[PDB]
């Protein structure tokens, strides 16, 4: 009943994931015309989000930011982030130790190893995950992906992103509980919003559903590979439901 799709991933992007399956993968028609169509790891967008502190950011940039600082983070870090350019599609199946990495990413359902022996958890890294949690949770906590900027200098200043996990299903109550702790971002957001008289900025935040998970077997943890350790959070029976890109400000 689950729908999966074999995808072209570069063999210099198949790592991590290939060591320990479970990641989000975003697609994007980027600026260079020769490699325009690219699929993306959640750890790979973690080095674009500011919320990952620069040590952990450059840690996974030392894992595979070689490709990141080849062309790709010059299209994401360097060329400024839009939430439009990235689109979440779910959690990887088919590890694929082949010649060219052909990773069969899931669309909807609980990401599984075939034969139903192993369930693929979603590895959400630590700094993009925790800080927007709500209450103590029971069995069907929902995952939302939210990109949240803050206006500093270059009509946007800095890109940043979050993975908010909350039981609160509804759109407007969820954006109000975002507006609770994002008062600072909307201060300096209002500041450069009134700076732009004729030029423009582009607004604060963008919310979308990602699914739900077992959430009482939820725990944090760590992976380790080339360029060392990586403290993450492990979401066990991660049902996938990519929702709509709903912006707020």
């Amino acid at each position: 009943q689950a729908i999966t799709a074999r995808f072209f991933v570069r063999e210099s992007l198949g790592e991590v994931e290939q060591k320990n399956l479970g990641v989000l993968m975003f697609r994007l028609d980027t600026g260079i015309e020769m490699p325009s169509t690219v699929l993306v790891s959640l750890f790979f967008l973690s080095m674009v989000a500011e919320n990952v502190s620069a040590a952990t950011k450059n840690t996974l940039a030392a894992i595979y930011g070689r490709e990141g600082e080849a062309i790709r983070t010059w299209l994401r870090d360097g060329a400024w982030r839009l939430h439009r350019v990235v689109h979440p599609l779910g959690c990887t199946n088919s590890i694929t130790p082949g010649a060219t990495c052909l990773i069969t990413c899931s669309m909807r359902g609980h990401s599984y190893n075939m034969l139903k022996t192993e369930i693929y958890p979603l590895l959400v890294p630590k700094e993009i995950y925790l800080d927007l949690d709500g209450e103590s949770t029971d069995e069907i906590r929902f995952v939302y992906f939210v990109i949240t900027y803050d206006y500093n200098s270059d009509r946007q200043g800095r890109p940043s992103a979050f993975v908010v996990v909350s039981r609160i299903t509804h759109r407007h109550t969820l954006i109000n509980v975002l507006r609770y702790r994002f008062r600072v971002s909307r201060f300096h957001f209002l500041n450069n919003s009134i700076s732009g008289y004729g030029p423009s900025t582009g607004c604060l935040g963008t919310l979308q559903r990602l699914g739900w998970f077992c959430s009482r077997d939820s725990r944090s943890g760590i992976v380790a590979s080339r360029a060392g350790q990586l403290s993450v959070v492990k979401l066990e029976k991660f049902y996938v439901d990519v929702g709509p890109l709903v912006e707020f400000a």
Binding site: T169, H170, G198, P199, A249
Partner: protein
Amino acid sequence: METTVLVTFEQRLTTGDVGKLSRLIGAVIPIPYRHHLLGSSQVGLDAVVKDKTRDYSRMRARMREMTLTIMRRVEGNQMILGVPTHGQCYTIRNTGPVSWEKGDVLTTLPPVFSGEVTGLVSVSDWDLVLPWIVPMALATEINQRMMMLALLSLDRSHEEVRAATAQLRVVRYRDATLTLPEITIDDTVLIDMRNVCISLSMIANLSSEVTLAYVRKLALEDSNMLLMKCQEITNYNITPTEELNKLTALFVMIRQITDVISEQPAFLVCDVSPDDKSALCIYK
């Protein structure tokens, strides 16, 4: 979590009550927990329709935190609340007092607030008052006027606010006349009205001068029946990419300020029965 709820009434259902459960078994219930087995005191939001402070803001917020079901199967005392799997077609009987405008998103209405009706029967001082399913535009209007009739009170005299609610709290629509709940001056209205003010102060700059003077120099050109009321209520730039970022940010602000007064979409209707009592519905 869970898709097929068994509900027991611990109270007393009679021959007339097991007759009257059949029509409600068309209808819709929000569940607080999404268990297979739930108590009838929890089943429905009738537990907090007797909130004695009685604000449609918190009726709204709790049905935002709820999740709907579809009632089923009058067998014994047990209730098969099928939690509707998203994007499947289901029959839904009406208690919202409209013919639902066939072809539209039908949506959740928290407490009607034109009188306190008993929904199913009053056994053990408990009735089953369901959210009434009124369309998306009517729900957006019904939250619009909620915010408007307290928006007037920040800068106008409260007696004039009362005299203007005396018009604008009775919604005029075909078979849809409702009286807004003696509109709640509240922090819940405040925390989103301040963000409405923020969005309008931001569109005060995201407004291009072209977007200012479009009506103001189209009224110089010709006439339109919007445009007369819009008359009532070198010079320009060549940066269309920055104007596209202006329009992107402006669209975020107007969709935010619309979802202020625009609640959750719900049932998209396949087939309304020809007596307009039952609706095959998809897209919860």
